[PDB]
Structure formats: C-alpha cells, structure tokens
Amino acid sequence: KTWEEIPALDKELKAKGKSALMFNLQEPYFTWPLIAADGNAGAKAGLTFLVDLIKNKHMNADTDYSIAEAAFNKGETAMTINGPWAWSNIDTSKVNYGVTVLPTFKGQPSKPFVGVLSAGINAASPNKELAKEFLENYLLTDEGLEAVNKDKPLGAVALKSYEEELAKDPRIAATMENAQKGEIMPNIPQMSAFWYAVRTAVINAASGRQTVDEALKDAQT
Amino acid sequence: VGLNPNFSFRGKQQTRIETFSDAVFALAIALLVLSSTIPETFEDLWASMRDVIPFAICVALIIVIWYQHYIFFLKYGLQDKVTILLNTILLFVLLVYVYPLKFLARFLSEIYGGIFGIIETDLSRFGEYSHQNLKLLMVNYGLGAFAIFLVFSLMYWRAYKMKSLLDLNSYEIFDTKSSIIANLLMCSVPLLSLIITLIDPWGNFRTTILSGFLYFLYVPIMIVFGRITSKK
Amino acid sequence: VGLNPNFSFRGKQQTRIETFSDAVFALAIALLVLSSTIPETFEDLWASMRDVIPFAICVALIIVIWYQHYIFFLKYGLQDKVTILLNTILLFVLLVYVYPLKFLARFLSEIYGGIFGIIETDLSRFGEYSHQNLKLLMVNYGLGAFAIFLVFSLMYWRAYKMKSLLDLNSYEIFDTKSSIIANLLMCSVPLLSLIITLIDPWGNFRTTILSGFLYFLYVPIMIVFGRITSKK
Amino acid sequence: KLVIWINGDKGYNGLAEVGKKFEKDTGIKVTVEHPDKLEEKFPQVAATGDGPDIIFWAHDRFGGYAQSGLLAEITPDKAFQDKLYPFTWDAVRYNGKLIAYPIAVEALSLIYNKDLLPNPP
Numbered sequence A: 001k002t003w004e005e006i007p008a009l010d011k012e013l014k015a016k017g018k019s020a021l022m023f024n025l026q027e028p029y030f031t032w033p034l035i036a037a038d039g040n041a042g043a044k045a046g047l048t049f050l051v052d053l054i055k056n057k058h059m060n061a062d063t064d065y066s067i068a069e070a071a072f073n074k075g076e077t078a079m080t081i082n083g084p085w086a087w088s089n090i091d092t093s094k095v096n097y098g099v100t101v102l103p104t105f106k107g108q109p110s111k112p113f114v115g116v117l118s119a120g121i122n123a124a125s126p127n128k129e130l131a132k133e134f135l136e137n138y139l140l141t142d143e144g145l146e147a148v149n150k151d152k153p154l155g156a157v158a159l160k161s162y163e164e165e166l167a168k169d170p171r172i173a174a175t176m177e178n179a180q181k182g183e184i185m186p187n188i189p190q191m192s193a194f195w196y197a198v199r200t201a202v203i204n205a206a207s208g209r210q211t212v213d214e215a216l217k218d219a220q221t
Numbered sequence B, C: 001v002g003l004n005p006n007f008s009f010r011g012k013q014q015t016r017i018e019t020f021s022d023a024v025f026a027l028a029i030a031l032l033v034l035s036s037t038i039p040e041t042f043e044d045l046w047a048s049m050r051d052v053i054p055f056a057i058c059v060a061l062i063i064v065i066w067y068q069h070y071i072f073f074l075k076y077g078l079q080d081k082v083t084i085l086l087n088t089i090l091l092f093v094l095l096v097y098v099y100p101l102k103f104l105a106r107f108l109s110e111i112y113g114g115i116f117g118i119i120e121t122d123l124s125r126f127g128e129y130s131h132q133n134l135k136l137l138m139v140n141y142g143l144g145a146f147a148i149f150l151v152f153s154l155m156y157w158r159a160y161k162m163k164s165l166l167d168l169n170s171y172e173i174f175d176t177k178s179s180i181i182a183n184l185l186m187c188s189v190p191l192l193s194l195i196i197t198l199i200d201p202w203g204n205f206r207t208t209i210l211s212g213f214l215y216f217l218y219v220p221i222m223i224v225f226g227r228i229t230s231k232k
Numbered sequence D: 001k002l003v004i005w006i007n008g009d010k011g012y013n014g015l016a017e018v019g020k021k022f023e024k025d026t027g028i029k030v031t032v033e034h035p036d037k038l039e040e041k042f043p044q045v046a047a048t049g050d051g052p053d054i055i056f057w058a059h060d061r062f063g064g065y066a067q068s069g070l071l072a073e074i075t076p077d078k079a080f081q082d083k084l085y086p087f088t089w090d091a092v093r094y095n096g097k098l099i100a101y102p103i104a105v106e107a108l109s110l111i112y113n114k115d116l117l118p119n120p121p
Ligand SMILES: OC[C@H]1O[C@H](O[C@H]2[C@H](O)[C@@H](O)[C@@H](O)O[C@@H]2CO)[C@H](O)[C@@H](O)[C@@H]1O
Pocket: A027, A028, A029, A030, A115, A195
C-alpha cells in the first residue's frame, strides 16, 4: 500500500529468484506519480527514493517498457506500473493479475497524470469530412469502441452509454481510483518542453550523472 | 435471496467458518430457551409459558445478527486470519450476552407487563432498583450493542482493504463503503447512551431516562449523523 | 428420495438456512434426552430407562417436523428474508415446546400405563388434576400444533407467491397449492380443539373429552373439511 | 405451389421446415409468406385475385371471412378430429360449420427482467 515497504518486499523476493517491481523508467509518465506524490521539496523527496531503488540494486538502470512487460507476463516480477492497454497481453499469458491503487509515498498518494485519448483531424488533409464520418458514426459508437476495447482496453471510455459496462469491471475501478488521486494534464504548448525536461532529469539521475538537486535546477529553467 | 442485483456473491459455497458460525448461532438461540428447567408439574408448565415473550424478543434479536453474518459471508466469501479473528470476537460477544439478554428480556417484559396491565407480579426478584444498578444496565447492554455493530464495520473495512484481491467492481465497492457507514451509524447510538451514562450529568434517574430514550429515537438520530456528514 | 417425479428440486445444494436449521433440530431432540440427570446409582439407571417411551414419542414427533422442513427446502431452495422470518418462527415454536413436550409425553405415558396395567405409580407428582389445568393442557399443546402447521402453510404460500421467480411448472404449481391446503387442513384440527376449550360449553371435563377426541378423529375430520371445499 | 399466409411475429421458418418435409414426400412446393396487414389484405385479395391457399390468424377474424364466403368448409375425419381438444374446435365454428383447423391458444402475459426486477408488480 506504500512505496517505502517495497525494499523489504524486494529483499524477500530476490531470495526466491524474483523481482518486486519492474516498470518503464525511461518514459517520465511512469515515474511522475512517485515524483509528484508529495508535491520543490516534494520532487526532491520522490526522486531521491527512485534513485535509492536503483542504487540499492532493486531496479535495473535501463528498465524499459518491453523488458518490464515481458518480465511481469513471464512471472519474474511481482508488480508493474501500466495502463488499461497493457491488460490484454497479461490475459494472453497465464498470470493471475490484479490492478490496484498506486503505492503511497510519505503517507500521501502518488499522483499519476491523467490522459484523455483523443482523435484530431490534420489541418493539411483533404479527407476532413470523411474522417468526421468515421470518427462520429463508426468509431465513437457502442459497437465501435467495443471493437477497439476487445483488442487492447481503452480504459474509461468517454461514451455515456458505456457507464454500466465500465462500472462492472474491477480494473476500471482501480484506474478511476488512481485518476482521482492524480490530475488531468494541461493541453498547453509548453507540455513538450516540460516532458523533455523531466525525461532527461529522470534518466540522468537514474544512470548516475547529475545529482537530484541539480536535476530540478536544470528542469525549472 | 440476495440484497443487490449488481453484487456478485463470492460466498455461495459453504465453508468451515460459516459452518462453525451456524453452530454457534443455533446453540445461542437453542440454549437460551433450553437453559430453562424442565417442568415437573402443571404449575411449572404455566410458569414456563410466561417466558415465550422474553424469548421471542431474544430470538428476534439473535437472527437479526445471524442475517447480517449470512449477508457478509455471502458477499465476500472471506476466510483469512483477520476475518477469522473479527468473526470470533463477534461470536464471543454474542455468547457472553446470551444469558444477560434472557435477564433483560424478562425484566423489561415485567415492566411493560405492569404498564399495559396484563400482569401485576413483583420486580423485587430482580434485586434493588437503584441508580447505580440501572446505570450499569445501560452501560452493559449498550457496550454489547456497540461492539456488535463495531465488529460488523471492521469486517466490511477488511473486505474494503481487500477490494482488489476480491475483484470488486464499482457497484460492489460502493456497497461495501455504504455497509461500513451503516454499521458505524448503528454503532453510535449505543456509544452515545454509554458515554452519557458513564459521565452521569444529573446524578440521578434523569441520566437513565435520556440514555434509554436514544434507542426509541434510533431512526431519527441515525438520520442526523448521516445528514451531518453529507452537509459537511 | 423425492416425493414427486415431476418436481425439479431447487434445493439439492445445502445452504446456511438449512445448516442452521439442522443444528436446531439436532439440538432439540438431543437436549430433550440429555437434559435429564446423569445416573449416579443403579436406582437412577432403572428410573432413567422408564423415560424412553416418552422420549420415543417426542423424537418421532420432532423428526416428522424435520422431514417437512427437509422437503420444503428441497423443493424450492428458498433463502429470502420472509422465508428466513417464517423459518425462525417455526424453530422458535419448536424450541419453546421441547420441554413442555417432555412433560406431556411423561404425563400421558403414566395415564396410558395405568390403563393397560403395566405400572401403578402416582400422578400427584404432576400437581392437581383440575378442570382449569386440563383445559390449559389442551389450549397449550393445541396452540403449538396449530402454529407449526400454520407456519408450513405460510411458507408454501410464500413459494406460491414466487412461482414465477422460481420458474414453477404446472405440476409444481399444483403441488405447492396442494401443500398449502394440506397444512391448513392439518392446522384446523388443533384450531378446533383450542376454540372449543376456550369457549368451554359444558363448564366441566366433557369439554376436555371432546377437545381431546378430535385428535383421535384426525383423518376423518380432515376428510370432512376437504370434502366440504370440493362439494361447494 | 402451396402458398401460406402467416404473421411475421410467428414461426414461418419452422412452418417452412414442415413444408420442406411435405415436398420430399409429395413433390409440391411449400412457400411461406408474411405480408403486412394480412388480416385486412386477405379478404380483399382472396375475394378478387388468388391470394393464399391457407390463411393463418387468430380465430376472431374468421367469422367475417365465413360470412363473406371467403373460406371452404373443413371436413376432418373422426380420428383426426379426436387428436385435438374439443374446446379448441368450438372456437373455429361458425353457424354449425368448421371454418378452420385450431393450432394453439394464445394469451398475453407479463414478461419481466428478473435482474432489473426480481419481485415484479
Ligand atoms: O512519457 C512521457 C509521455 O507521457 C505521456 O504519454 C503516454 C501516453 O499518454 C500513454 O497513452 C502511453 O502510451 O504512454 C505514453 C508514455 O509512454 C504523454 O501523453 C506524452 O506527452 C509524454 O510525452
């Protein structure tokens, strides 16, 4: 239920030839919840913990989406941090899985960023009216979203008609739980430069180049 | 058969905890009645039939607890250490309050018998009706009721804590949360009498009147506590 | 194993209501026997063996109720609030009449013992055999029997009320309807003694003779009530 | 060609499976049609044109067809007659003449969703 009790659990699991937690450390979207759990003082706390996990050899230095996914699906790691989309691949494997609340850090919850999957029409396209037809009458329909969802889960769909079906799924409940503890990302043009600043900062601190104090300095600029 | 249409009953199969529990409930209601002496003469026979009103009240009370138990184990199908622990605490409280309930039920049946005018038999058999004794009466039975509902709240909270392990959906999570609130709200009324009696503001029977009067205003006082949390 | 070949048994799986119920029935017949004192000497041992005739009559009576219970829960597999309520009322009545049955069975065993000429022991142990006491004897046990059959009728009517939910076929509907009638017809005989005793037309033992004589004419009087409804 | 008129809310596909067994044992085609407003299209078409060979509808509409002269008198032998309930034959009788073959008794019931409503009104 807490981030701070993972090192103990990892010691226990490493004795039996298993990892505790493996997730994508390269992409900052996955590390941000821990960083933003308290908050600055909050970013310094959250990141130092993440740095200590790699320093204590609990997590690998270059842990990416593929080796994390594969390890969990194989049955090598006890935990992983991922989205709705990842569930179908677990179902394919013979792993009795559960989706739950993200661990708390310094008592307070880990605040994961909330994304709204969205379809936009390219300004330089001649098929603008044909795409509108596809999006409205064929995709954003009960039947249409069902098709996408049975391949790889969408999460909490924007369609009003899908509320009953969403509410019947335990994994969706866990997703909504984390979404409430998190916050929706602003759409602003500066998001790109922000994400890049966090992507470098996390990689530098993970590998062992820049200090945790110096990471937030370069990122705030 | 079931309370909610959106709830997926994990405990349709009978288990040892439930079997054991059924034995205890059956034993409680059975020994309450059959702890009495066997009539040897016509006089004893008629005396023993005066006990049915007190017993009906006791039995009604015990099955109500049994029902809540049935519904909990039906909902979650739980069987872990902590559930076993909380379950034992429940049955323990039940058991220690079986004979005291027989007592209270007989006592109140005589008091209400006198009021309505059905009978006119003595209450000197029960001992002296003093302020200290009447206060201890509230504190005792009040502490009993509080505990039962307190334990039901803890049991539902244990299921809430294992929501993911139990694969609880949004409807089931909501039910569980509502069941905790219900049991805590039920718990508060005896907690409020008990506290009022233990402080004893008036230093006389007035204390006992108020403490006793909270049970008659169960439904309205429960609504006040529920309304306070929703208004904020 | 089953009563009807056209009936689809919904209650083949054991449930909590049935498990609880089995505990109570087992406890009733067990404590009836084992409520007696432990023999400490040869004299007590022989005394205790005189109790087997009264106990056999009591036990036979209780399993007959258990059987009806077994068949009902087998037929419908019911587990709702109202079924729980009616089921509790049943077990409650059973329980309050366990020790009174022990009494009646011992009393009647002495009376029939005197008649046949097996024994010649005193009935003064039971108290004075007065008109009022012998009337209360009928009213008591008559009220008990009436209630048990009344409850069985209510239980079958609850299943009839849920015929669609239970997916009852034309044969099953017919059985259910017949089971209601059976239990009401069974119920009437004790209802008729009880009423005759409570009015007391003669003002003497004659009342008790008639009231008692309706049980000996159970089968024929049941046929009269059944024939009256069919003739119209 | 054997043509049958029955309502679209009924089992015309199943009626066709019976018709398919008939063609195997005789050689006659059995087509099953379900046109809209057949209860009021039959007495107009069958009077003037050809229409169907056999018409399927609830017994209530058949007296009007019988009075108008749009239906042949049914003459079934005792042994066939005895296979059906005597009360059913009464429904298909107009002025002491059998005007149809009884198939089944139909009555409306309350259909309810047990999940949304376990104890319905
Ligand atoms: O990693 C930073 C990256 O995170 C988010 O992208 C998510 C995307 O939203 C998810 O759907 C998922 O596929 O993973 C991506 C990260 O791996 C932001 O949306 C994006 O701007 C940002 O670059």
